[PDB]
Amino acid sequence: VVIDPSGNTYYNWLFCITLPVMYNWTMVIARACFDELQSDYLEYWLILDYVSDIVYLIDMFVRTRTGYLEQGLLVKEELKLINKYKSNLQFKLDVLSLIPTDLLYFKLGWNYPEIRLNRLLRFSRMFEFFQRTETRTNYPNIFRISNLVMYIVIIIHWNACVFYSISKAIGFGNDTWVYPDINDPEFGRLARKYVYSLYWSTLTLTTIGETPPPVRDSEYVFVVVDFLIGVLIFATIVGNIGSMISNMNAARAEFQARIDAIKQYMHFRNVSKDMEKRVIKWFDYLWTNKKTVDEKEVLKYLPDKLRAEIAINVHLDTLKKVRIFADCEAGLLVELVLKLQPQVYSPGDYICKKGDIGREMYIIKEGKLAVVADDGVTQFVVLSDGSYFGEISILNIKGSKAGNRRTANIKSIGYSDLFCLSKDDLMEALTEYPDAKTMLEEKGKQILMK
């Protein structure tokens, strides 16, 4: 066997059924309208149509064999798969698409391939494959733009075929609007026919005009209706493409709008040029190191377990270096990485100063932190990445010298990225982990005697 829809082989068959359906949506109407296209390459079109019908029959076999989810589980019982496939509208559309209409080649001649319009009813396979591709590709917006561009190409090609067919019904060369006479050697070539029809359909759908005006009421009706198609349907697709291109830039546009709002606020308040330059440097650091994206808003819809799975892989290198996590039991990390808030500090920033209230502890993800004196001109010792600080004034140290006050000045040299862990978030993990609390109290009481 039973093919998993989430599996890779189902995607491979989705592509392998999309190729003949895309062939049918393009070439069947072209062969039906451009009779020279069907007549000249009849062997090639017969081979391609028979291959497409064989692939349709293998898609029959796959649709009877692909699984469907029932109460979460993927059921693999054959009769259940058969009944589920047959009960759907998909089976009816597919079996109407695969009726043997090729037997009507004898009744209507070999120049009538418009009896294969039933084969377009496998469009659901195209849309399903395009939905599955956009989920699993690394560039979803680019593929979406290409898909809508191809929809434009299909609509333009179909309008070209329709215009050629209407010129055929009215008569070539009878009017200045229709396609010219085939008896002209230049306009009698099949390439000229298709390419001029594509030109007419392109200019008409895009509402450029600059084409010979209709001289017949049916031509006026078709031109009005197809201008309306180009307005309602085509221009909507072009607007969707523009919206998708804007959605590529959406995070960058939002971040630049934040920058513009902050600069406009700072321009009104007559802030000094040094602070404006500092804020500009901070935002240039944010974009240059690509820290504009935030973890909270992107992963806001995720469950806690899957956010924990992601946050471990993001902070793999940091959480091995820390003495609290992944050194003894590695148990509280899966519960506590959700409580960590990443914060980035500018060079020279004082994170916590002596005599200040301690509402959080810090874990150094990146950067080099230094402990300094009251003036801060010199540094006592430097703290590398992976370490942690600011835990003295958080938990209840027995016999504390000051208590709930910072015992050291923390100077941030360079741009240090480091996690934040507040009071109650830390207590809601320490109450369930008394052993982890004791290890922190030990080093806290060991370092507080100085």
Cα separation of 156 and 61, whole Å?
Answer: 34
Q: Which of 28, 37, 62, 344 binds a second copy (CB under 8 A)?
A: 344
116 a known binding residue? no
Interaction pattern, residues 257-296, with a second copy; x per rule: CB under 8 A? xxxxxxxxxxxxx-xx--x-xxxxxxxxx-xxxx--x-x-
- Residue 260 within binding range of another protein, rule CB under 8 A: yes
The item of ligand PCG, a second copy, another protein, none sharing an interface with residue 396, based on CB under 5 to 8 Å by kind, is none
Residue choice 277, 320, 401, 443 for contact with another protein (CB under 8 A): 277
- For another protein, which stretch binds (CB under 8 A), given 20-28, 98-106, 361-369, 440-448? 361-369
With CB under 8 A as the contact rule, the residue among 129, 336, 416, 440 that binds another protein is 416
> Three-state SS for 340?
coil
- The gap from C-alpha 264 to its chain's centroid, in whole angstroms, comes to 32
Residue from 83, 174, 380, 396 touching ligand PCG (CB under 6 A): that is 380
- Shortest distance in whole angstroms from residue 130 CB to another protein: 12
Q: Within 296-355, which residues bind ligand PCG (CB under 6 A)?
A: 352
Binding at 98: pick from another protein, a second copy, ligand PCG, none (beta carbon under 5-8 Å per type): none
C-alpha 242 chain-centroid distance:
16
CB of 16 to a second copy, least distance (A): 18
Q: Is 25 in the site for a second copy (CB under 8 A)?
A: no
Contacts of 274 (CB under 8 A, 6+ apart): none
Q: Amino acid letter at 403?
A: G
Query: How far lies 202's CA from each of 163, 198, 259, 380, 383, in Å?
Result: 11, 6, 41, 73, 65
Residue 317 CB contacts under 8 Å (≥ 6 apart), including other chains: 386
375 binds another protein (CB under 8 A): no
Does 393 count as an annotated binding residue? yes
State the nearest-atom distance from the C-beta of 304 to a second copy, in Å.
8
- Judged by beta carbon distances under 5 to 8 A according to partner kind, the member of ligand PCG, a second copy, another protein, none in contact with residue 352 is ligand PCG
Between CA 361 and CA 398 the distance in angstroms is 18
Q: Does position 80 bind another protein by CB under 8 A? A: no
What are the two backbone dihedrals, phi and then psi, of residue 72, each rounded to the nearest 5 degrees? 85, -40
Judged by CB under 8 A, the residue of 251, 338, 371, 448 near a second copy is 251
Among 86, 92, 136, 320, binds a second copy (CB under 8 A): 136
**8-state DSSP, 376:** -
Q: Is 407 annotated as a binding residue?
A: yes
Comparing CB distances to ligand PCG, the nearer of 205 and 430 is: 430
For residue 337, give every residue at least 6 positions away whose Cβ sits within 8 Å of its Cβ, in sequence order, or none. Answer: 308, 311, 312, 315, 319
Q: Mapped to the 3 state alphabet, what secondary structure does 251-297 carry?
A: HHHHHHHHHHHHHHHHHHCCCCHHHHHHHHHHHHHHHHCCCCCCHHH
**Is 393 an interacting residue with respect to ligand PCG (CB under 6 A)?**
yes
C-alpha separations of 225 from 52, 111, 221, 344, 370 in Å: 33, 28, 6, 59, 74
Cα gap 119→26, rounded to integer Å: 11
Which position among 98, 310, 427, 448 is part of the footprint of a second copy (CB under 8 A)? 310
Backbone angles phi, psi at 332, to 5 degrees: -80, -10
71 touches a second copy (CB under 8 A): yes
Q: Pick between residue 389 and residue 419 the one whose CB is nearest to ligand PCG.
A: 389
Strands annotated E in 346-429: 349-350, 360-364, 368-372, 379-383, 388-389, 409-413, 416-422
Stretch that binds a second copy, among 44-52, 102-110, 173-181, 328-336 (CB under 8 A): 328-336
Residues in contact with ligand PCG by CB under 6 A are: 352, 358, 371, 380-381, 389-393, 406-408, 410, 447, 450
Residue ranges of the binding site for 3',5'-cyclic AMP: 406-407
